Scaffold this active site. Structure first.
Site, short mmCIF file in Angstrom:
data_model
loop_
_atom_site.label_atom_id
_atom_site.label_comp_id
_atom_site.label_asym_id
_atom_site.label_seq_id
_atom_site.Cartn_x
_atom_site.Cartn_y
_atom_site.Cartn_z
N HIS A 1 -6.84 -7.06 -1.13
CA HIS A 1 -5.85 -5.99 -1.01
C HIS A 1 -4.64 -6.32 -0.13
O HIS A 1 -3.55 -5.76 -0.36
CB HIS A 1 -6.49 -4.69 -0.53
CG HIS A 1 -5.51 -3.57 -0.35
ND1 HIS A 1 -4.80 -3.02 -1.41
CD2 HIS A 1 -5.09 -2.92 0.76
CE1 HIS A 1 -4.01 -2.07 -0.96
NE2 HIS A 1 -4.16 -1.99 0.35
N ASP B 1 0.84 -1.20 0.00
CA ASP B 1 0.00 0.00 0.00
C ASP B 1 0.88 1.26 0.00
O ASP B 1 1.83 1.34 -0.77
CB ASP B 1 -0.95 -0.05 1.20
CG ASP B 1 -2.10 0.94 1.10
OD1 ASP B 1 -3.17 0.57 0.58
OD2 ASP B 1 -1.95 2.09 1.58
N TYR C 1 -1.70 11.64 1.48
CA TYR C 1 -2.42 11.76 0.22
C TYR C 1 -2.47 13.20 -0.31
O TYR C 1 -2.62 13.42 -1.52
CB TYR C 1 -3.86 11.27 0.39
CG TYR C 1 -4.00 9.76 0.55
CD1 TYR C 1 -4.20 8.94 -0.55
CD2 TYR C 1 -3.95 9.17 1.81
CE1 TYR C 1 -4.36 7.58 -0.40
CE2 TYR C 1 -4.10 7.80 1.96
CZ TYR C 1 -4.30 7.02 0.86
OH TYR C 1 -4.45 5.65 0.99
#
Length: 287
Positions: free
Chosen positions: A267, A97, A203
């Site tokens: 994931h 990730d 982010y």
């Protein structure tokens, strides 16, 4: 197993540690923490010094203030200083990730620091940009990143017992049977102790929202276009956030690569299918 801190690059990072010998350093992503690697800590700590960091902003690591404290150069220097500070010149780097975003970048910039790289679901610097430009399924899957730029998102994630975070990690994990009640407990504590502002700050430095940013070659700036060290990918095919095509043509950027695709994992294969994952890691480590 012990829980320790190390001061690097102007922050104190918390980490889980076990074993001794060569370094196997694990980097989680959003919205997990060091605990996601528990099955690997257990398995590899008899032959390696297994260290799983809580990234800055997460769990019991320091939460430095401002978006600039979560920029890629800062995160990359964190990793370099962790390796050195723990007394190593190189390690096996294991990433997932956001941790893969950072780890891939670190590997390209500092290959001498990385003996071998093992990457789970997450963005490869070059192929991810290609898929953003071309793949409507990826574009869709990654729409949350644009939304995360909004000042309202922190409230959304924290609302009512971290409902937003529970949707991402707990609910899927409980349904599928890979998170115990104690695992859920650990995750909830991690969110109470951690900072959602810090987690979102990662982010908010992303440059992938502009027609001409989408044109950049790599997610984060790189001079290096090839990574020549041994690399293993361990990829859950069902991942709703990263499409399988992220892996297409990756050999151009990573000539010595092996890829293992899990048809029944999503994931986070490392704790979804730990048994199968560990055997593939052994195989790669021993090749």
């Amino acid at each position: 197993m012990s829980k320790q801190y190390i001061n690097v690059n102007g922050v104190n990072l918390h980490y889980i540690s076990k074993g001794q010998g060569e370094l196997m350093l694990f980097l989680h992503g959003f919205p997990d923490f060091s605990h996601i690697w528990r099955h690997q800590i257990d398995e590899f700590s008899n032959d390696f010094h297994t260290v799983a960091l809580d990234l800055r902003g997460y769990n019991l690591s320091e939460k430095p203030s401002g978006l600039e404290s979560y920029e890629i150069d800062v995160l990359v220097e964190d990793i370099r200083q962790v390796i050195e500070g723990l007394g190593y010149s190189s390690c096996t780097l294991v990433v997932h990730d956001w941790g893969a975003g950072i780890g891939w970048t670190f590997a390209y910039r500092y290959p001498e620091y990385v003996q071998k790289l093992i990457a789970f679901n997450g963005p490869h610097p070059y192929t991810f940009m290609r898929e953003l430009r071309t793949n409507k399924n990826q574009q869709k899957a990654s729409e949350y990143m644009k939304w995360f730029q909004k000042q309202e998102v922190q409230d959304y994630m924290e609302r009512d017992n971290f409902s937003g975070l529970r949707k991402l990690v707990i609910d899927p994990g409980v349904k599928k049977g890979y998170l115990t009640a104690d695992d859920v407990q650990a995750y909830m504590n991690s969110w109470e102790n951690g900072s959602v502002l810090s987690m979102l700050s990662y982010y908010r430095n992303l440059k992938i929202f502009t027609e001409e940013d989408l044109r950049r070659k790599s997610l984060f700036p790189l001079e290096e276009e090839v990574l020549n060290i041994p690399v293993q990918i361990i990829w859950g095919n069902q991942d709703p956030t990263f499409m399988p095509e992220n892996l297409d043509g990756i050999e151009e950027y990573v000539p010595n690569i092996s890829v293992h695709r899990l048809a029944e994992a999503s994931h986070a294969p490392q704790h979804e299918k730990p048994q199968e994952v560990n055997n593939v890691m052994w195989n790669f480590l021993n090749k």
